Each structure stands twice: as structure tokens, then as C-alpha cells.
Scaffold this active site. Structure first.
Site, PDB file in Angstrom:
ATOM      1  N   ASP A  50       0.870  -1.168   0.000  1.00 17.58           N
ATOM      2  CA  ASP A  50       0.000   0.000   0.000  1.00 17.58           C
ATOM      3  C   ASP A  50       0.907   1.218   0.000  1.00 17.58           C
ATOM      4  OD1 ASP A  50      -2.973  -0.639   2.126  1.00 17.58           O
ATOM      5  OD2 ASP A  50      -2.334  -1.474   0.206  1.00 17.58           O
ATOM      6  N   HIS A  93       3.397   0.560   3.080  1.00 17.92           N
ATOM      7  CA  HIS A  93       3.399  -0.578   3.992  1.00 17.92           C
ATOM      8  C   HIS A  93       2.592  -1.740   3.463  1.00 17.92           C
ATOM      9  CE1 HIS A  93      -0.728   0.154   5.547  1.00 17.92           C
ATOM     10  NE2 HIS A  93      -0.412   1.438   5.469  1.00 17.92           N
ATOM     11  N   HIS A 153       1.556  -7.193  10.124  1.00 19.23           N
ATOM     12  CA  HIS A 153       2.640  -7.054   9.163  1.00 19.23           C
ATOM     13  C   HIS A 153       3.377  -5.736   9.394  1.00 19.23           C
ATOM     14  CE1 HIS A 153       1.907 -10.439   6.158  1.00 19.23           C
ATOM     15  NE2 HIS A 153       1.051 -10.642   7.146  1.00 19.23           N
ATOM     16  N   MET A 199       7.175  -4.221   8.292  1.00 16.76           N
ATOM     17  CA  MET A 199       6.882  -4.216   6.861  1.00 16.76           C
ATOM     18  C   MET A 199       6.337  -2.870   6.382  1.00 16.76           C
ATOM     19  SD  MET A 199       5.627  -7.469   4.609  1.00 16.76           S
ATOM     20  CE  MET A 199       5.775  -7.331   2.845  1.00 16.76           C
ATOM     21  N   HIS A 215      13.034  15.363  17.232  1.00 20.08           N
ATOM     22  CA  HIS A 215      13.744  16.499  17.811  1.00 20.08           C
ATOM     23  C   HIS A 215      15.233  16.282  17.583  1.00 20.08           C
ATOM     24  CE1 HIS A 215      14.398  19.745  20.871  1.00 20.08           C
ATOM     25  NE2 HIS A 215      15.577  19.153  20.913  1.00 20.08           N
TER      26      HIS A 215
HETATM   27 CU   LIG Z   1      14.884  18.079  24.958  1.00 19.02          CU
HETATM   28 CU   LIG Z   2      -1.683   3.037   5.506  1.00 19.70          CU
HETATM   29 CU   LIG Z   3       3.353  -8.427   4.621  1.00 21.36          CU
END
Ligand SMILES: [Cu+2]
Ligand SMILES: [Cu+2]
Ligand SMILES: [Cu+]
Ligand SMILES: [Cu+2]
Ligand SMILES: [Cu+]
Ligand SMILES: [Cu+]
Lengths: 336, 336, 336
Positions: free
Chosen positions: C95, C132, C142, C147, C252
């Protein structure tokens, strides 16, 4: 600026004030760049954080949780004398998110009990910014023990809206929000410890659950409620600076709004407007500007309402003035 | 406006409909300011929230979780008649995040079973805003019992992008996302109760973990799938209003995007564009505008995928129309 | 474009490289739209995620967690050959949040072990985007098995700030952040499993707590430290692409800032500036641009400091160059 130019800048000492109040400052800078000098003594002390006598071994800049708000202007220098009394038992330091280099200053400010240090940094960026202690290998433990605060770096010409119109507050408050992780025994009773280090292992276990036992403003449940509510009047413009050094929050003024909100805390990033609930990620400060339009009690909360009303993250404003029936009116009062 | 001026304004009665549908309304305001009238009856009822027969004692505005979407325009007055029937057991009220004063209306709307109230407020700020019950001392309990919804305050000239170009939707849907905290017994089986008060203590214990047992759209796992999948066609412009009164969410249209997203939910704050996943903090509503370009099934989720696919925060869209191979094509279908 | 016009476009085969590095690309597009070709083989493999030897049965695009960064320009076509070797045991797919239709491509790329597929999509929107695996009914499993990765769709004219000025980075790094949910035994030690399937039920239990045991960059605690620390120089402009497919993060740069941050990851959404800590919701990628001004060691973290320093979400930069005492100086080094 050249070496001579930096050495020639005026130095000015400022006396700090405990949160939620803020020390003397001008919104528009007074004169050219200055070296603004602050001093803070670190206090390790037991504090009670709720109505059940629950204790935390706090590690407190200037004796308060959160540490006090320091205010300078863009391109000033902030010069902090940090003192670690011999009565303390841990090494401490300070990281300013506003600063550039040496981990925000932590690499240069590691002080054992009986030591002090002076750090200067140039405040190159306008905004509200977190500061916190960060001893290598024990960073979150100091932070979640209350060792954090914020600074405000005002634009030299004060605050403005996204269209360049000036925004001048009549008053400012600093709300520091603290997640605490207090160990419990197998009966569910909060534990007490003789020394800060004794609580280390048990506290880290609680920290690892990512679930605070308490989430508080100004260091304790109800610290900003009742006779310690913040105040305003209808027509008054208030800036509310809010920080959370470790964990996300979502401030909301119940009954009001964030008219202008620098949700990222940075004044060069245009403020969001007309906000119901804004979002400040862990490790940041934000600022909201509101003009009060109605009198009465307001609640100011982290709007995860379990955090607000079960875990401690609720403050009050007490606001004076005339009710405005145009904005709101009870057409028919509760009646059977 | 004066009391006299308000009394002279046109009145319009609105008939509310069950989410995710939205009552009839106009995007551009029809004429000058009106007093827009709504009525909701509060229903305390059992709801079944998953396919294991798990129950919640819902506290439901207009009998649904979430409560229905109310639509007005900027500077209209929203006049709500709120009814707490004698069949209910608890006091209830209403807080509108859109409103100004008396904790959003909650201070003026406290109704015992057998009572009703009429609240009027000026909708001064354009946006989508949460509303929720907030009985003093019992706030998160009512909210996480499903006692929340949202309103939309449209600009009088309808929606625009960040550059003043008009944005006109063909359809609008309201997705209310709810975190539930259902008590379990010693065998990990969800408990059932025969009155809302009976569930209280056990529910509060779960709430304090900050870990919901279910996170759902429209009151149940799978609510907005199958017979209740949302629908569109290729070329259709759709506005998805999304609220979460207590906890953060991160909406995502799987297979699509948020072309324009008022992530903060406020229309005077310019929308983000081309969004994959947006963020709505607990205590807020947001809205996303999308033009469908591909037919087929889309999933609409909170993109913490554990929350989406283990805890229940997943809806579907069924979209009709012609497939676009320029946008996407299978060059080689799955094969050896 | 028609099938004929797409067939007429140039093809370019890219060799992927392992994160945090990124394959060779040009910031400004070279010539007109092309079909940019990538190949990835999926590996189900045991990986070690900490210094204790804790194992995860990873599901890894191109054998790495995260999967590698694919870079194209807006209106290029991304053509992926995805191979599921017969040595694997599960069906997998892909996807792309960047893509439009068929659930981001997942509906068209379901491949069993011993199968391959080729998906082409038009990269219509500029930004960084998560990709993913998402097998229906097994999606979070997954994803939290590693993944997932990201792509960058650069504007054809390269990056610009909010105000039309070109931003050109000297180097780029891709930090993929992964939440893992590792089961523990009765002593609280992490469990090892002979086969991936053996871990499923135990892992789903941990997943439901919404509390990861590990939060890591580049697949393991400390992966981007020591001789694998990222590097820069004073004056060097670095783009840091950060993704999290399942769970929020708050990046950060300790000692630094985000000079320009596309926190939503979308380049048509103007970047925030002067950031201390930015926020990327689960299911999204973000990007930050920074010009280093001070030499030394920096920590790049998720600024929930528990997640950073207890659970693993900390990387280092080693930065060469000359210290700037204007920006920061130790006026008095730690002393009695
Ligand atoms: Cu900090
Ligand atoms: Cu998604
Ligand atoms: Cu998978
Ligand atoms: Cu509220
Ligand atoms: Cu400290
Ligand atoms: Cu209620």
C-alpha cells in the site's frame, strides 16, 4: 557581531518569579541586543502532588515545578548561572531547546553538588521553547521528576498576527504540565522513598508503561484551581504559555478559545486561529492568545478528559466583568 | 446585537438526522443571520459495540453515538432545546466548544431527569467544533459513554481553499470516533451490567489506564461498513467531518487522500493540502475535502492500525465509476 | 495520459540502497516525466533489535526495517516489481500512501510465496509518504513486524520554502521509526519463537496494550549510533525524512532545530519554521531541513524521552567543524 561588539553589549540581571507568574519584561525590546542574566538554584526535595499525600522526589530548577519562565528577545543572549548546592545528591545540567550546540547546553553545564556553571547562548529564534535537565543516561528520569520549564524569546517588535497586526497581551501566564510516574506497592498504594536514587528502578518500570499516574499543572493536582485560579477580566488579552517536556498534551480553555495559537510555539510560523483545542507535542512549548468576552469560572485543561479530571490536568480562570447575552443566554433555565 | 435586534431575526427549525448523514443545509448562507433551532432528547441506553455482544451503557444525544451534526453559519444563533426524559437516571448538560461563556453552555444547561432547557449562543467562529456533556465531577465518564458530537459553523460564503477559491462539496459525512473502556472479569470476558451507575466504578478503573478496549466509529465495530458503508462516485467532492471528544486520532482515507484538510477544524486557519494522514487532537473536530478519482472500496481509518484493525476504528467507502489506469495499473498481476 | 503516451515515456531503473541512506537522485527533475522502475524482494527474517539479543520475526521489504526510500518526481510513474520468494510463508502486498486507488495498491499486489507482481502508479502529489504491507485481516501485524517504509515525491523544481525560495540539501537521510510489541515471559524476559506463526497470538496481546516494548530507528536500539551515526559538517544542509507507519512520533534534533519542517510531509503545505520538536502522526512521513551551525555530537530523538532513552528511539549525528562561541559559550565551566 565581532568579539568587541559582543563584549560591549549591556548586561542586565533579572529577578525570576515562580510559575504561573512571569518576571518583568517588555513585549517590544528596549534598546538593542542585551546579555540577560538569570540565576537558578537546583533543589531536590520531596513534594506532595495530590490530595492523598502522594510524594515525588522533585528535581526543581529554582525550587519549582515547572522551573520558571525566562523571557528575552530575539538576538539577545541568555546567560544563566546554574547552581547545584552541596546538599543535593545528583549531578544536574540544563538543555535549552532555544539554544544551538552542545545538546542545547547540557554538554557544557554538568554540575555535581557543590558546583555552579555559567552558560551563555544567543537566542536566535523567536518562540516559546522547553528547557530541561538531561544528564547523559538519566535524561527522562530527571525530566519526569519535574526538572523542566520553558523560556520565551519574543520578537524584537513584540507579537503579531498572521497579517502583521500587533498582538499585545495585558497579562501572561506560564502553565507547565508534568507527567509523573509514581510507583505503587501490590495493594495499589503509592510508595515512599528515603532518597531520590532509591526510587530509580521502581520509577523506570512505571515510566516504561508510558502511562503516567498523575498529569498535573504547576506541580500538583489542583495547583491552579480554587484560591490559586488564574484571573482575568472581560476585555483583557491574555497569553497562556504551555509546555510539556516529555509527553503530548492538548490544551483547551473550556468556555473560551485560542484566538491565536502558536501551536508549534514558534512565532515565525503563523498562528492558528479560532482554536477549540490545540496540540503541543512532548518536548515542546506552545502559546495561545485569548481576549476574554464572558465573566465566570473557566476550566483550562488537557482535553484528554481522563487526564484532566482523573489524573490532575485541570486549571481554572476566574474572570470578572459583565455577562454578554448576545454571545450566550439561557432562553429557558433547567425546569420540570 | 441587542435583545430587540435578535428577537426580530428569522427563525428556522431544523430536523436532525442520524450520523454519518447530515441534516439539510445550504453551504452558502441563505440571507442574513438567523436563529437556528434544534431539539435533542437524551437517551440512556445499552449499545452493543462488537460482534462478541460487548455492551456499553451509552448516554446518547438524540439517541445516537455520536450525537448528530448541527449545521449553522457564522454569526447565526444556535438555539438548542435539550431534554432529559424521566426515563433517564442521571443529570446531563451540554458544552459547545463553538460557544463562548459558561463552560460552553454546560453551566446553564444542567438538567435532571424530567427537565428540559433552552440555550442560545452566537456562532461567532467558523469551523467544526466538538460538543459534549460535562456534569461537574463526572465529565470524562459521560464523554466516554458516548455523550458527544459535533457542529459545523460554515462561513456565510461557504468553504474556500487557502487562496479564496470556492470549495463546494457534493456530499458530507460525519464520523464520530469513540474510545470505550469496557471492564473485564478474571477470564478476560467483558462484563455486563443492568444500570449505568452499576458500571461506574469498574469503568473508571479502566479509564485510568488510558488504554481503551475499543475505538469505534458511529458507536460500534464495523458500524460504517456493509449496510452502512459511505458512498461516492468518481468525480464527486466529499467532506468528511471527524470528531474525537476525549482522545487523539489520525484519520486516513486508504486509497485516497485529504486534498484539503482543516486539521484543526477551523475554517479561518488555511487547510493543509495533499494529506496522507491528518491529526485531530482529543477534544476537537477536523474536516477533510476529497474528490474521488478511482472506483472501488476504500477504508477510512484511524491510522494507528492497531486502533483501526484490532480495536475497531475502520469505516468503508464504496465508490462507483470508471477505473483510471493512468493513475494506477497492474502491469503484471500476481503470478509465478 | 493515454496508454500510448505512457509507453512512449523514458524508463529509468533505480538500484535501491539500505536506510538511512537514499539512492542517487536529482533534486530538480532531469527532463520530462519518466517511468521510474524499482524492484524489492520481501524477506521474512529473524532480526535482533537490542544489545540483549531480543528477536523479532521481521517482514522486510528489500530485507531491511524500514524498507528503503524510493525517490521520484511529481508526475513521474513509480513502477514497482514486488517479489514474494517461495521461502516465505505468508501472502504480502504493498500500500503506497502516495498512490490513488485500490487501497494504495494493496488490492492489486496480493502475492503468495513464489509470486511476483508489477504495480505502476502516477505520483500526482509531492511529499514524503508511507508505504506498507496490508493483507486484509492481518494489517497491523505485518506493519509492526517492520513491513513499512516511505517514498519521496519531489516537486519537479526541487524543494522550496513557504515563500518561493529554493531549498537545496547537501545530503539526505531516511529515519524509519518502528514500534515493536515483543511478548515477555513470567520473569519479564522477552520470548523467542521458533517460527513467525508461533509469535502471533502473544504479539497481538501486546499490541492491544497500545504500549510498544521497543521504539527504534533503522530496526534496532542504537542502530544509528557509533560507526553508524549519521554525519554532517558545520554549514551542511541536511534533509531528514522520518516515517512512522503505525504510531505517532515527535522528532527532535538535540542541540539543533528544524529550520524548515514539512510536518505533514506534503511539500505543497508550507513548512513550519524554527522548530524545536515536530509531530508526525502514525501513518505518515515528515521531513525536516536543517543547516548545522555547531560541531559535535547531536542526538536525534522521538522526544517522548522515555521512548527515546528507555525504549530505543535515539540516533546520533557526528558533526565536524569549528565551535561558534557567539551562538553558545561556557562563561564559567562547572566549578566549585
Ligand atoms: Cu529536549
Ligand atoms: Cu496506511
Ligand atoms: Cu506483509
Ligand atoms: Cu470539551
Ligand atoms: Cu537534573
Ligand atoms: Cu451526560
Amino acid at each position: 557581531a565581532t568579539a568587541a561588539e559582543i563584549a560591549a553589549l549591556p548586561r542586565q540581571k533579572v529577578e525570576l518569579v515562580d510559575p504561573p507568574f512571569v518576571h518583568a519584561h517588555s513585549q517590544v525590546a528596549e534598546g538593542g541586543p542585551k546579555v540577560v542574566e538569570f540565576t537558578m538554584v537546583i533543589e531536590e526535595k520531596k513534594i506532595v502532588i495530590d490530595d492523598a499525600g502522594t510524594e515525588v522526589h522533585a528535581m526543581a530548577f529554582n525550587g519549582t515545578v515547572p522551573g520558571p519562565l525566562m523571557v528575552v528577545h530575539q538576538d539577545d543572549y541568555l546567560e544563566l548561572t546554574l547552581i547545584n548546592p552541596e546538599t543535593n545528591t545528583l549531578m544536574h545540567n540544563i538543555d535549552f531547546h532555544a539554544a544551538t550546540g552542545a545538546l542545547g547546553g547540557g554538554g557544557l553545564t554538568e554540575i555535581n553538588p557543590g558546583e555552579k556553571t555559567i552558560l551563555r547562548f544567543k537566542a536566535t529564534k523567536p518562540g516559546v521553547f522547553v528547557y530541561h535537565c538531561a544528564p547523559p543516561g538519566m535524561v527522562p528520569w530527571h525530566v519526569v521528576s519535574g526538572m523542566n520549564g520553558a523560556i520565551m524569546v519574543l520578537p524584537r517588535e513584540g507579537l503579531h498576527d498572521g497579517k502583521g497586526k500587533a498582538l499585545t497581551y495585558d497579562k501572561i501566564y506560564y502553565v507547565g504540565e508534568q507527567d509523573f510516574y509514581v510507583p505503587r506497592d501490590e495493594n495499589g498504594k503509592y510508595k515512599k522513598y528515603e532518597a531520590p536514587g532509591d526510587a530509580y528502578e521502581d520509577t523506570v518500570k512505571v515510566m516504561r508503561t508510558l502511562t503516567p499516574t498523575h498529569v498535573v499543572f504547576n506541580g500538583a493536582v489542583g495547583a491552579l484551581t480554587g484560591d490559586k485560579a488564574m484571573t482575568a477580566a472581560v476585555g483583557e488579552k491574555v497569553l497562556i504559555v504551555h509546555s510539556q517536556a516529555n509527553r503530548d498534551t492538548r490544551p483547551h480553555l473550556i468556555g473560551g478559545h485560542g484566538d491565536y495559537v502558536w501551536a508549534t510555539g514558534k512565532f515565525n510560523t503563523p498562528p492558528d486561529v479560532d482554536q477549540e483545542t490545540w496540540f503541543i507535542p512532548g518536548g515542546a512549548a506552545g502559546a495561545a492568545f485569548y481576549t476574554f468576552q464572558q465573566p465566570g469560572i473557566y476550566a483550562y485543561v488537557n482535553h484528554n478528559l481522563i487526564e484532566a479530571f482523573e489524573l490532575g490536568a485541570a486549571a481554572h480562570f476566574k474572570v470578572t466583568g459583565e455577562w454578554n447575552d448576545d454571545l450566550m443566554t439561557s432562553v429557558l433555565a433547567p425546569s420540570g
